[PDB]
């Protein structure tokens, strides 16, 4: 699709067997999702921006379906105010910014 | 252009005759610039980011060039990790996400 930016670019994702809404965010290096369980090992990470930093759990090799497209990569899990699909996964679905 | 997301989508902007680097951020509703002098009056605004809500200064109807495209609109000034070009100005220059 071609998505305009008059409103937040929200899409449906499937992660961990769960359907969620998430923001396509070109300003985010990595994908961060609200608290949920994911399989495998994790390590702590700090990520920050407006308003400061939050602590998250970094899970690697996680499969997500993003508006119908499958991708694999790192997913951060923690107290993010919104679910964010970052560049690390948007590249895998071929997402680009065009103007 | 067509900007891929393997790297941060950093572009040059021009505001008040000065060149600056900024991030094209589809996850940002608003445009936020590092401390600088802008003309006119400002009004208060609260914005939320990954770490919580902050106060910023809101300046309206500010002329800004973004990767050589002219925009005129609201610019927020405050504590920000990077200069952020948000959806309010990305819409003006015709930017869309495509996959
Ligand atoms: C600030 C940029 C440089 C980085 N953030 C992404 C931004 O898109 C961020 C996303 C967001 C939307 C709404 C609520 C909370 C966060 N929007 C944001 O702050 O919008 C503000 C600035 C003006 O308009 C409003 S981040 O969330 O800190 C982040 C950092 C690291 C990773 N791996 C993932 C996310």
Swiss-Prot record, chains A, B:
Relate the assembly described in the record: Homodimer, whose active site consists of two apposed aspartic acid residues.
User: Where does the source fall among the domains of life?
Assistant: Viruses
Native source organism of the sequence: Human immunodeficiency virus type 1 group M subtype B (isolate BH10) (HIV-1)
Entry protein name: Protease
- Domain Peptidase A2, by residue range, is 20-89
Catalytic positions? Answer: 25 (for protease activity)
Q: What sections of the protein cross the membrane? A: none
Q: Where is this region: Dimerization of protease?
A: 1-5, 49-55, 88-99
Q: Which residues of the full protein are shown?
A: 501 to 599 of 1447
Q: So what does this one do? A: Aspartyl protease that mediates proteolytic cleavages of Gag and Gag-Pol polyproteins during or shortly after the release of the virion from the plasma membrane. Cleavages take place as an ordered, step-wise cascade to yield mature proteins. This process is called maturation. Displays maximal activity during the budding process just prior to particle release from the cell. Also cleaves Nef and Vif, probably concomitantly with viral structural proteins on maturation of virus particles. Hydrolyzes host EIF4GI and PABP1 in order to shut off the capped cellular mRNA translation.
């Amino acid at each position: 699709p071609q998505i305009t930016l008059w409103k937040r670019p929200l899409v449906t994702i499937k992660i961990g067997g769960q359907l969620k809404e998430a923001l396509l965010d070109t300003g985010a290096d990595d994908t961060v999702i609200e608290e949920m369980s994911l399989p495998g090992r994790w390590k702590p990470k700090m990520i920050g921006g407006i308003g400061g930093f939050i602590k998250v759990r970094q899970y690697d090799q996680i499969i997500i379906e993003i508006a119908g497209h499958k991708a694999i990569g790192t997913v951060l899990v923690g107290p993010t105010p919104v679910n964010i699909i970052g560049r690390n996964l948007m590249t895998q679905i071929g997402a680009t910014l065009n103007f």
